């Protein structure tokens, strides 16, 4: 009772700004069974009906929604979506939960695979987020007001009351320090190291109304609306261009940092990891995930094997462009 996975959707026909908070996409409250998770973007899209409102969707639905709702760039959408799906989705039913585990993704895969959703900590979701607390403290998915207060503080201190690139640079480093000091299991390597810098600029490039073209900066009201209430600002117009992680290099430059983590279940004991992916060694990330998938799926056969092969190729198509050329791996051979 499986599905044949379609290739990834391409870019939208129209790539300009438009009203996305419109009559066909109203904010609605959560009903019982509806799933939300650590991504404010996907949360908002589900709560406006760009995604299924229950928070379970196909990879193709996620790509279309991120493009339609926010003008997320096509390749960035492919890289993030199939990463999330390979690690956390059900490859047979072609369904991914944007939060925790649910029967809505269908019959479970064979362990060690889990199809447990974007909430699963360790390989995609990780530490030193802006509005979510590290998993060590007990909840890696819920909005956290204490962290949002720090968001506001840093915006007051560095951005005249608004979130801009200067704020992003300072906040990213401070949050890393918070975790070093307080989380003995703190990890900041591989996937998390790369995705964390991109996440800090998404509020600027995607959450700021697209009619704003000079001095792009996010108000705390708009930040609260998306990060906490999963709601587009009134009359929200998406980015006038497809966009992703522009400026992430500047965030790293403001406080140069190396992948690693706290060693030996001890705080204030951050050790570099020289084998981790970084921004000049991106193909390492590709290989780490192919390997993680091999751990989840040690001996797949049948429809599962087929869908794995397809989804792996789909992910490579995005990664190849985004990382500037990586040799494709074939852990389960070819079709």
Ligand X SMILES: *[C@@H]1O[C@H](CO)[C@@H](O[C@@H]2O[C@H](CO)[C@@H](O[C@@H]3O[C@H](CO[C@H]4O[C@H](CO)[C@@H](O)[C@H](O)[C@@H]4O)[C@@H](O)[C@H](O[C@H]4O[C@H](CO)[C@@H](O)[C@H](O)[C@@H]4O)[C@@H]3O)[C@H](O)[C@H]2NC(C)=O)[C@H](O)[C@H]1NC(C)=O
Ligand Y SMILES: *[C@@H]1O[C@H](CO)[C@@H](O[C@@H]2O[C@H](CO)[C@@H](O[C@@H]3O[C@H](CO[C@H]4O[C@H](CO[C@H]5O[C@H](CO)[C@@H](O)[C@H](O)[C@@H]5O)[C@@H](O)[C@H](O[C@H]5O[C@H](CO)[C@@H](O)[C@H](O)[C@@H]5O)[C@@H]4O)[C@@H](O)[C@H](O[C@H]4O[C@H](CO)[C@@H](O)[C@H](O)[C@@H]4O)[C@@H]3O)[C@H](O)[C@H]2NC(C)=O)[C@H](O)[C@H]1NC(C)=O
Rule CB under 6 A: say whether 160 interacts with ligand Y: yes
Rule CB under 6 A: say whether 165 interacts with ligand Y: yes
User: From the list ligand HEM, Mg ion, ligand Y, none, which binds 124 (C-beta under 5 to 8 Å, kind-based)?
Assistant: ligand HEM
Q: Minimal CA–CA distance to 115: which of 124, 123, 105?
A: 105
Our CB check for ligand X shows the closer of 28 and 156 to be 156
Rule CB under 5 A: say whether 132 interacts with Mg ion: yes
DSSP 3-state assignment of 324? coil
**125 assigned to a ligand binding site:** yes
Q: Minimal CA–CA distance to 175: which of 232, 128, 207?
A: 128
* CA dihedral of residues 39, 40, 46, 48 (deg, nearest 10): -170
User: From the list Mg ion, ligand X, ligand Y, none, which binds 49 (C-beta under 5 to 8 Å, kind-based)?
Assistant: none
Q: How far apart are CA 104 and CA 1, in angstroms?
A: 14
Question: Within its chain, how far is the Cα of 64 from the centroid?
Answer: 15
Q: How far apart are CA 152 and CA 161, in angstroms?
A: 7
What tokens does 279 get? 């921004």
Rule CB under 5 A: say whether 210 interacts with Mg ion: no
Our CB check for Mg ion shows the closer of 162 and 197 to be 197
Q: Minimal CA–CA distance to 96: which of 78, 110, 84, 107?
A: 84
- Pick from 182, 219, 250, 294: which binds ligand X (CB under 6 A)? 182
What region does 70 belong to: left with phi over 0, alpha with psi -120 to 50, or beta?
A: alpha
Rule CB under 6 A: say whether 251 interacts with ligand Y: no
**C-alpha neighbours within 13 Å on the C-beta side of residue 133:** 14
- Pick from 75, 164, 187, 225: which binds ligand Y (CB under 6 A)? 164
**130 assigned to a ligand binding site:** yes
Question: Within its chain, how far is the Cα of 325 from the centroid?
Answer: 22
- Pick from 93, 166, 239, 276: which binds ligand Y (CB under 6 A)? 166
If residue 177 lies in a helix (H) or strand (E), which one and from where to where?
A: helix 165-182
Report the nearest approach of ligand Y to the CB of residue 135 (Å). 31
What tokens does 190 get? 């591989």
Rule CB under 6 A: say whether 79 interacts with ligand Y: no
User: From the list ligand Y, ligand X, ligand HEM, none, which binds 72 (C-beta under 5 to 8 Å, kind-based)?
Assistant: ligand HEM
**324 assigned to a ligand binding site:** no
Give per-residue burial for 273-302: e unless 16+ CB within 10 Å, then b: beebbbeeebebbbebbbebbeebbeebee
- Pick from 59, 116, 129, 169: which binds Mg ion (CB under 5 A)? 129
Rule CB under 6 A: say whether 42 interacts with ligand HEM: yes
| Residues within window 40-59 making contact with ligand X, judged by CB under 6 A | none
Q: How many residues bind ligand X (CB under 6 A)?
A: 11
Q: What are the residues binding ligand HEM (CB under 6 A)?
A: 38-42, 62, 66, 70, 72, 77, 80-81, 84, 118, 124-126, 129-132, 199, 202-203, 206
Binding-site sequence positions for Mg(2+): 125-126
Binding-site sequence positions: 39, 125-126, 130-131, 192
Q: What are the residues binding ligand Y (CB under 6 A)?
A: 159-160, 164-166
């Amino acid at each position: 009772q499986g599905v044949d996975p379609p290739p990834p959707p391409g870019p939208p026909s129209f790539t300009g700004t438009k009203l996305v908070n419109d009559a066909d996409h109203p904010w609605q409250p959560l009903r019982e069974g509806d799933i939300r998770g650590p991504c404010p973007g996907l949360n908002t899209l589900a709560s406006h009906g760009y995604l299924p409102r229950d928070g379970v969707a196909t990879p193709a639905q996620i790509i279309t929604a991120t493009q339609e709702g926010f003008n997320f760039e096509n390749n960035a959408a492919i890289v993030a979506t199939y990463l999330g799906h390979l690690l956390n989705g059900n490859l047979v039913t072609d369904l991914l939960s944007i939060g925790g585990a649910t029967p809505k993704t269908g019959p479970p895969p064979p362990p060690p695979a889990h199809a447990g959703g974007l909430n699963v900590h360790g390989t995609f979701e990780g530490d030193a987020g802006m509005t979510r607390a590290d998993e060590f403290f007990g909840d890696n998915h819920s909005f956290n007001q204490t962290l949002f207060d720090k968001f506001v503080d840093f915006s007051n201190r560095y951005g005249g009351g608004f979130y801009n690139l200067t704020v992003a640079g300072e906040l990213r480093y401070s949050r890393i320090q918070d975790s070093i000091a307080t989380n003995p299991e703190f990890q900041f390597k591989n996937v998390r190291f790369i995705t964390a810098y991109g996440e800090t600029v998404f509020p600027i490039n995607l959450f700021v109304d697209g009619r704003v073209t000079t001095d792009r900066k996010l108000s705390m009201e708009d930040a609260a609306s998306i990060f906490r209430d999963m709601r587009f600002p009134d009359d929200f117009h998406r980015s006038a261009v497809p966009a992703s992680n522009e400026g992430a290099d500047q965030v790293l430059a403001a406080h140069p940092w190396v992948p690693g983590g706290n060693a030996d279940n001890q705080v204030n004991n951050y050790v570099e990891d020289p084998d981790s992916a970084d921004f000049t060694h991106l193909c390492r990330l590709y290989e780490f995930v192919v390997g993680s998938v091999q751990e989840l799926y040690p001996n797949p056969t049948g429809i599962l094997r087929r869908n794995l092969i397809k989804n792996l190729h789909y992910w490579w198509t995005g990664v190849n462009v985004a990382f500037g050329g990586c040799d494709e791996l074939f852990p389960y051979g070819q079709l």
